[PDB]
């Protein structure tokens, strides 16, 4: 924002100076004389009698806006040994032109910088539906239909201070690059659109004197492969004094916004609302989660069969995250392209007033089981070899290498999660599982000590240890699947002696162990952060793994209240020894384990308590923009 004014003794120069910019003088170019002096009016400060040498720097600064055009003046008097002083005149008009936004991230350089010492305003994607009896997200049209909609938007203000006749001969234009105009929309308040997808520039109607003009800005797209997340809005001051010449830019200024990313919440963030769509065949399951929700002080919402279309897997069609700006935080549903019976639920029931909506991927096919959000989780806050991840790290399951028979989460999804930047995704190995979800082998639960959590992992090892121990104590005859009328009981001794079952579970152990070490490296975990949950598996179709008995790690974590699938283990001394083992592991952390009968309703259809439910949790207090990804 430098300006070099050429002064000439042939004729007076006229020029505008925007306060806060650098104005310098070319005194030599058109000089007559050896020396020069400068005299200015009191409102102009000259930094710099001197010789007429090109390298002499003369800079002008004005203290305040002009009351009238040319109301400040500079007189450069050129003189020499035998030469009467020759004067050149410069008439100046000072103005204030400041485009302001919440760049300190509280309440209202042109670079956006991350961290607690950084600078740059935040913009939210206007992806919720505050409008009354409507179907569209607020950002899809070009009007503000509700006053509360403005709460989601970012305030930008143009303060000007000029002479009363200034815009007779100057005009301000507000603009956005054509490459960015599809991702933002800006409204002028008195609300109507001035900038947006169809309109990259607008002539502002601005009166002279002191004026303040308010704009509200909404983002229309999340960061993604094609969009780093920055929007720049610019004000240009144009000289329109000459009716026979094009307009001339005399000043530009900008504000850069960053669009807020979609952020997930781990199991360690306090729960606010529990979801089930357990209106289908069975009500006792639904009774148990309802009791847990009540216990954990959560709102409860349930999706009935008429809307379910017999799709009970509430975990899988969606993930409830949030977006956060200094002025506004709101939950936002990421809708999976899974699109099974629950397809309409996120659209029709979850998005709404102060509940946003995002989706990715192809919506009519081209998808896989790894696109179900049982395969989408996040770790608690972690620090990894000095690098801090204060919002945790997204975890999703993959194959170990791409083959003709391997599955992955769709690239569009993977690409969206990475572009949010703030929970740096980690690919885990889940494709050994029939269903294929990371929620089939891991969970996180709060803990009052160490890093504030434990990683729980399914463990065949722990279960064989448990069963061998019982057998060693004379309980070899004890029956797995006691309590189940429509099932073949199996004795501890027969389970242990089964060599194929053992081989299968060794292969599974290896798969989970691979993930263990991977989580250890990528989350900075030590063994002491990890608890193994006794769990047997069996290989079936395509040698893919399924739970031998109810997969206890596929649990609903509602703070210290846990909803754990009931394994129906061998009953020794009046109690299922699996439940007893799990309790011995988790109760010491102050966790309360509730065992829920999901056997014929969920287990038998390839999922458990976690798979049949979902949870909205409290957003992190840590502000994402304060991270340095």
């Amino acid at each position: 924002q430098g300006t070099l004014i050429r002064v000439t003794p042939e004729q007076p120069t006229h020029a505008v100076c925007v306060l806060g910019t650098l104005t310098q003088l070319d005194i030599c170019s058109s000089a007559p004389c050896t020396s020069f002096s400068i005299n200015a009016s009191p409102g102009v400060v000259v930094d710099i009698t001197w010789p007429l040498d090109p390298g002499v720097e003369v800079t002008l600064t004005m203290k305040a806006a002009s009351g009238s055009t040319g109301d400040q003046k500079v007189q450069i008097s050129y003189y020499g040994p035998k030469t009467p002083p020759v004067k050149a005149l410069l008439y100046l008009t000072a103005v204030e032109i400041s485009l302001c936004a919440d760049i300190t991230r509280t309440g209202k350089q042109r670079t956006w910088t991350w961290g607690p010492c950084g600078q740059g305003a935040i913009l939210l994607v206007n992806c919720d539906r505050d409008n009354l009896e409507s179907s569209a997200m607020d950002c899809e049209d070009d009007e503000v239909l509700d006053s509360e909609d403005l709460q989601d938007m970012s305030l930008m203000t143009l303060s000007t201070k000029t002479p009363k006749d200034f815009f007779t001969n100057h005009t301000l234009v507000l603009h956005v690059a054509r490459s960015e105009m599809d991702k933002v929309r800006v409204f002028q308040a008195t609300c109507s659109v001035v900038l947006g997808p169809k309109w990259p520039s607008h002539y502002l109607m601005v009166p002279g004197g002191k004026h303040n003009m308010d704009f509200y800005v909404e983002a229309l797209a999340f960061p993604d492969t094609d969009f780093p997340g920055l929007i720049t809005l610019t004000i240009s001051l144009l000289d329109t004094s000459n009716l026979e010449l094009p307009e001339a830019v005399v000043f530009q200024d900008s504000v850069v916004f960053r669009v807020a990313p979609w952020i997930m919440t781990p199991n360690t963030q306090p729960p606010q609302e529990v979801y089930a769509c357990s209106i289908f065949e069975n009500e006792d399951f639904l009774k148990s989660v309802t009791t847990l929700a009540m216990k954990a002080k959560c709102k409860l919402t349930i999706c009935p069969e008429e809307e379910n279309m017999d799709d009970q897997w509430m975990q899988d069609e969606m993930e409830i995250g949030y977006i956060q700006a200094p002025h506004k935080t709101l939950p936002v549903v990421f809708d999976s392209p899974r699109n099974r019976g629950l397809k309409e639920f996120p659209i029709k029931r979850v998005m709404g007033p102060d509940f946003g909506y995002v989706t990715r991927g192809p919506q009519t096919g081209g998808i896989s089981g790894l696109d179900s959000f049982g395969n989408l989780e996040v770790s608690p806050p972690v620090t990894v070899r000095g690098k801090e991840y204060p919002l945790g790290r997204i975890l999703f399951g993959d194959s170990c290498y791409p083959s003709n028979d391997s599955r992955q989460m769709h690239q569009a999804l993977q690409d969206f999660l990475s572009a949010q930047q703030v929970q740096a995704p980690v690919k885990l190995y889940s494709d050994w599982l029939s269903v294929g979800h990371v929620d089939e082998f891991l969970s996180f639960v709060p803990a009052p000590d160490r890093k504030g959590f434990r990683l729980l992992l399914a463990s065949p090892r722990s279960c064989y240890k448990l069963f061998q121990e019982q057998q060693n104590e004379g309980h070899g005859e004890a029956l797995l699947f006691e309590g189940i009328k429509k099932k073949k009981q199996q004795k501890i001794k027969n389970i242990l002696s089964n060599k194929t079952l053992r081989e299968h579970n060794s292969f599974v152990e290896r798969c989970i162990d691979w993930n263990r070490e991977l989580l250890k490296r990528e989350l900075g975990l030590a063994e002491s952060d990890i608890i193994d949950i006794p769990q047997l598996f069996k290989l079936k179709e395509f040698s893919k793994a399924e739970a031998f008995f109810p997969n206890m790690v596929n649990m609903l974590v509602l703070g210290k209240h846990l909803g754990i699938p009931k394994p129906f283990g061998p009953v020794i001394n009046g109690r299922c020894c699996l439940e007893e083992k799990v309790c011995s592991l988790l109760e010491p952390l102050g966790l309360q384990c509730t065992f829920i009968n999901d056997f014929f309703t969920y287990h038998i259809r390839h999922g458990e308590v976690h798979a049949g439910t979902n949870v909205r949790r409290k957003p992190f207090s840590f502000k994402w923009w304060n991270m340095v990804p």
Binding site: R340, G369, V435, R605
Partner: peptide
């Protein structure tokens, strides 16, 4: 009706 497909 299974989790799988």
């Amino acid at each position: 009706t299974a989790r799988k497909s």
